[PDB]
């Protein structure tokens, strides 16, 4: 499958199965903000009127799974990430926001165990809605995304980033590259105000960082682009601490 059929099959899945419950289908993220590199994920935000039955969620999982990349597969497909929100659940705005459904490949093992996304609160979705609201591509629907979402205070985006870092520093063992560059991304957006891709945020923050930390940050960029880095002897704790403290100074 090509990038074009990937996106098109997602649009028709949502339309065929969500029928008149579907308000809008939007894409956001690195692919819309920076351009579609062959490495880029396909990130979808979907807005609905009412909750989805546990049947509809299983269908979505079933129909999305064949057309999304699977981890560590050497294919050329892209990862599909898709979030569903109910328009009415976002008013009045409240952090953390309500999330109706998530398709994501980090959940595949659980999907195989029968796991079925239930309504949950997701502090990270505040950063997504903030990102999507500022730049998105509408691929279905009669309204622009900004018309379907209340103003989101950037203060809540700050609360969002800090709360995620707090658990990130405790859970970097074995997803080191993600955690380092997430924090690097995290630092950029809390100052300037814009979100950017991990690999570009990594080399931007590494430049402003003491050598030992820069060395390790740039070794994270490489792994994110494939390279097998083997962190078992790198002192990731120090850079995590450095990035976290740097971040805690907003």
Q: What are the structural domain ranges in the chain?
A: 1-152, 153-250
Nearest CA to 7 among 36, 48, 34?
36
Q: Which DSSP state fits 121?
A: E
Nearest of 202, 198, 186, 176 to residue 249 by alpha carbon: 186
Experimental method: X-ray
Is the separation of the CB atoms in 225 and 199 below 8 Å? Answer: yes
Query: In whole angstroms, what is the distance from residue 188 CA to residue 36 CA?
Result: 21
Kindly state the DSSP code that residue 245 receives in the 8-state scheme: H
Decide if 160 contacts 186 (C-beta within 8 A): no
CA distance 246 to 228: 28
């Amino acid at each position: 499958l090509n990038t074009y059929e990937q996106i098109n099959k997602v649009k028709k899945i949502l339309r065929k199965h969500l029928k008149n419950n579907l308000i809008g289908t939007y894409m956001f993220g690195s692919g819309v903000e920076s351009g579609l590199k062959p490495n880029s994920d396909l990130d979808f935000l979907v807005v609905v009127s009412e909750p989805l039955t546990d049947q509809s969620k299983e269908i979505l999982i079933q129909k999305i799974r064949p057309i999304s990349k699977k981890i560590g597969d050497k294919s050329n497909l892209r990862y599909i990430e898709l979030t569903i929100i109910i328009q009415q659940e976002m008013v009045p705005w409240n952090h953390p926001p309500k999330q109706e459904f998530i398709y994501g490949e980090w959940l595949q093992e659980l999907y195989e165990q029968g796991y079925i996304p239930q309504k949950e609160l997701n502090s990270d979705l505040t950063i997504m809605l903030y990102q999507a609201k500022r730049k998105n591509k509408r691929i279905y629907g009669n309204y622009d995304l900004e018309e379907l979402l209340p103003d989101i205070p950037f203060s809540d985006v700050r609360r969002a980033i800090m709360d995620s870092s707090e658990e990130l520093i405790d859970n970097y063992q074995d997803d080191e590259t993600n955690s380092i560059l997430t924090l690097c991304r995290m630092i950029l957006t809390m100052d300037t105000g814009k979100i950017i891709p991990k690999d570009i945020a990594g080399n931007a923050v590494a430049e402003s960082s003491p050598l030992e930390h820069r060395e390790r940050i740039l070794l994270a960029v490489r792994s994110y682009l494939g390279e097998n880095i083997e962190w078992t002897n790198e002192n990731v704790n120090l850079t995590i601490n450095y990035l976290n403290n740097r971040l805690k100074k907003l």
